[PDB]
Design an enzyme around this catalytic site. Structure first.
Site, PDB file in Angstrom:
ATOM      1  N   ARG A  56       0.862  -1.253   0.000  1.00  0.00           N
ATOM      2  CA  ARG A  56       0.000   0.000   0.000  1.00  0.00           C
ATOM      3  C   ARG A  56       0.863   1.254   0.000  1.00  0.00           C
ATOM      4  O   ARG A  56       0.356   2.359  -0.028  1.00  0.00           O
ATOM      5  CB  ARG A  56      -0.971   0.044   1.171  1.00  0.00           C
ATOM      6  N   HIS A 124       0.079 -14.225   8.642  1.00  0.00           N
ATOM      7  CA  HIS A 124      -0.402 -14.427   7.240  1.00  0.00           C
ATOM      8  C   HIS A 124       0.294 -15.586   6.512  1.00  0.00           C
ATOM      9  O   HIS A 124      -0.108 -15.870   5.354  1.00  0.00           O
ATOM     10  CB  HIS A 124      -0.355 -13.082   6.486  1.00  0.00           C
TER      11      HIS A 124
HETATM   12  N1  LIG Z   1      11.632   1.379   4.392  1.00  0.00           N
HETATM   13  C1  LIG Z   1      10.524   1.791   5.008  1.00  0.00           C
HETATM   14  N2  LIG Z   1      10.595   2.501   6.158  1.00  0.00           N
HETATM   15  C2  LIG Z   1       9.443   2.844   6.778  1.00  0.00           C
HETATM   16  N3  LIG Z   1       8.164   2.663   6.382  1.00  0.00           N
HETATM   17  C3  LIG Z   1       8.152   1.939   5.238  1.00  0.00           C
HETATM   18  C4  LIG Z   1       9.239   1.556   4.489  1.00  0.00           C
HETATM   19  N4  LIG Z   1       8.802   0.862   3.364  1.00  0.00           N
HETATM   20  C5  LIG Z   1       7.499   0.978   3.361  1.00  0.00           C
HETATM   21  N5  LIG Z   1       7.053   1.558   4.493  1.00  0.00           N
HETATM   22  C6  LIG Z   1       5.636   1.658   4.926  1.00  0.00           C
HETATM   23  O1  LIG Z   1       5.297   0.339   5.341  1.00  0.00           O
HETATM   24  C7  LIG Z   1       3.851   0.287   5.355  1.00  0.00           C
HETATM   25  C8  LIG Z   1       3.403  -1.070   4.908  1.00  0.00           C
HETATM   26  O2  LIG Z   1       1.981  -1.096   4.797  1.00  0.00           O
HETATM   27  P1  LIG Z   1       1.324  -2.159   3.825  1.00  0.00           P
HETATM   28  O3  LIG Z   1       1.913  -1.999   2.472  1.00  0.00           O
HETATM   29  O4  LIG Z   1      -0.104  -1.880   3.939  1.00  0.00           O
HETATM   30  O5  LIG Z   1       1.711  -3.666   4.391  1.00  0.00           O
HETATM   31  P2  LIG Z   1       1.149  -4.442   5.717  1.00  0.00           P
HETATM   32  O6  LIG Z   1       2.166  -5.507   6.058  1.00  0.00           O
HETATM   33  O7  LIG Z   1       0.767  -3.416   6.676  1.00  0.00           O
HETATM   34  O8  LIG Z   1       0.020  -5.144   4.974  1.00  0.00           O
HETATM   35  C9  LIG Z   1      -0.817  -6.030   5.786  1.00  0.00           C
HETATM   36  C10 LIG Z   1      -1.310  -7.150   4.926  1.00  0.00           C
HETATM   37  O9  LIG Z   1      -2.174  -6.594   3.889  1.00  0.00           O
HETATM   38  C11 LIG Z   1      -1.817  -7.199   2.655  1.00  0.00           C
HETATM   39  O10 LIG Z   1      -2.938  -7.545   1.836  1.00  0.00           O
HETATM   40  C12 LIG Z   1      -1.043  -8.484   3.028  1.00  0.00           C
HETATM   41  O11 LIG Z   1      -1.796  -9.620   3.451  1.00  0.00           O
HETATM   42  C13 LIG Z   1      -0.248  -8.006   4.234  1.00  0.00           C
HETATM   43  O12 LIG Z   1       0.309  -9.065   5.033  1.00  0.00           O
HETATM   44  C14 LIG Z   1       3.387   1.314   4.322  1.00  0.00           C
HETATM   45  O13 LIG Z   1       2.569   2.280   4.912  1.00  0.00           O
HETATM   46  C15 LIG Z   1       4.642   2.079   3.873  1.00  0.00           C
HETATM   47  O14 LIG Z   1       4.375   3.477   3.907  1.00  0.00           O
END
Ligand SMILES: Nc1ncnc2c1ncn2[C@@H]1O[C@H](COP(=O)(O)OP(=O)(O)OC[C@H]2O[C@H](O)[C@H](O)[C@@H]2O)[C@@H](O)[C@H]1O
Ligand SMILES: CC(/C=C/C(=O)NO)=C\[C@@H](C)C(=O)c1ccc(N(C)C)cc1
Ligand SMILES: [Zn+2]
EC number: 2.3.1.-
Length: 281
Positions: A56, A124
């Site tokens: 996301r 997950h």
């Molecule tokens: N290097 C970084 N440093 C800090 N923040 C970061 C970085 N890279 C990305 N981000 C943030 O990292 C955040 C990641 O948010 P999401 O992408 O929603 O992943 P989830 O693990 O929460 O997704 C949950 C489940 O949903 C799915 O369908 C699957 O089933 C997943 O398992 C983002 O807001 C980025 O801004």
């Protein structure tokens, strides 16, 4: 399934300016020193610096799908290395600053970093783990198992059983592994400090676990480039790269980030190592 709610995708990033980022990481050091029971919650943001896309983020899997573009991998899952953040978490466990670790990630990198599986909830699933539909015996493979959605991989159980091995990757309609969810919940409820790293906290119940820490007056810290579902509930929000935040934290704590030996599986947490004495706060 095709209409599965993928939540808020591609929200703008936020960058704490440098003096503010330094002060907030010093306050994160202060909470770790003061807390008896620290639980880490990780998501896809902690692997983006290994070349695995998040879901996301601006270039995440769902964000790109929404814009009719493709996410990009800069690695396979087999060739991916644990980030500085993954190996910091290994160390915080070893010295007893991390009680438990709750991850949404399927990328297999906490396991492969040598993080002890008995202190890990993989909510997950894990791309590298298949499980005997008969005896429930898990196998941690050196390659991704090859299916998703709890399907038959085509391999059979080798425990003194011949049960059908299946992947552990949940599809949208699949409820969470009961053991992993129950341990994560228990850890989160019992914690006085819950720290979220690189998760937008949009999935129930995974993203809601850190709120359980707020019960009985625990503290909640959120580290994330984008806004998250529970921003208003945070005692502290750090907007920066999780590797920058964790390297600085480890320096304040007087801990080394350890060498990665290459892919290694640890079933059970070793005895805790010596750690630095605490500052007078
Ligand atoms: N290097 C970084 N440093 C800090 N923040 C970061 C970085 N890279 C990305 N981000 C943030 O990292 C955040 C990641 O948010 P999401 O992408 O929603 O992943 P989830 O693990 O929460 O997704 C949950 C489940 O949903 C799915 O369908 C699957 O089933 C997943 O398992 C983002 O807001 C980025 O801004
Ligand atoms: C990014 C990722 C894990 C990241 C991680 O674990 N970071 O830590 C896994 C990829 C395989 C992915 O999940 C995916 C899922 C569904 C899909 N369609 C329904 C078309 C297309 C791709
Ligand atoms: Zn079996």
């Amino acid at each position: 399934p095709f209409t599965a709610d993928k939540g808020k995708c591609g929200l703008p990033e936020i960058f704490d300016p440098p003096e503010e980022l330094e002060r907030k990481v010093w306050e994160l050091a202060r909470l770790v020193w003061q807390s008896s029971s620290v639980v880490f919650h990780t998501g896809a943001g902690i692997s983006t610096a290994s070349g695995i896309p998040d879901f996301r983020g601006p270039h995440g899997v769902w964000t790109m799908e929404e814009r009719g573009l493709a996410p990009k991998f800069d690695t396979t899952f087999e060739s991916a290395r644990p980030t500085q953040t993954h190996m910091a978490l290994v160390q915080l466990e070893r010295v007893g600053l991390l009680r438990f670790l709750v991850s949404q990630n399927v990328d297999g990198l906490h396991v492969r970093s040598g993080f002890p599986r008995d202190k890990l909830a993989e909510l997950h699933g894990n791309m590298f783990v298949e499980e005997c539909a008969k005896c429930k015996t898990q196998y941690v493979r050196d390659t991704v198992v090859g299916t998703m959605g709890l399907k038959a991989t085509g391999r059979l159980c080798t425990v003194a059983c011949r049960g059908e091995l299946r992947d552990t990757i949940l599809d949208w309609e699949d409820s969470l592994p009961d053991r992993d969810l129950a341990l994560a919940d228990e850890a989160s409820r019992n914690a006085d400090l819950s720290i979220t790293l690189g998760t937008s906290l949009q999935i129930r119940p995974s993203g809601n676990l850190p709120l359980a820490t707020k019960r009985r007056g625990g503290r909640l810290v959120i580290v994330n480039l984008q806004p998250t579902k529970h921003d208003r509930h945070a005692d502290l929000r750090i907007h920066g790269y999780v590797d920058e935040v964790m390297t600085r934290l480890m320096k304040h704590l007087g801990l080394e980030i350890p060498a990665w030996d290459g892919p290694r599986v640890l079933e059970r947490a070793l005895p805790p190592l010596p750690r630095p004495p605490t500052p007078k706060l």
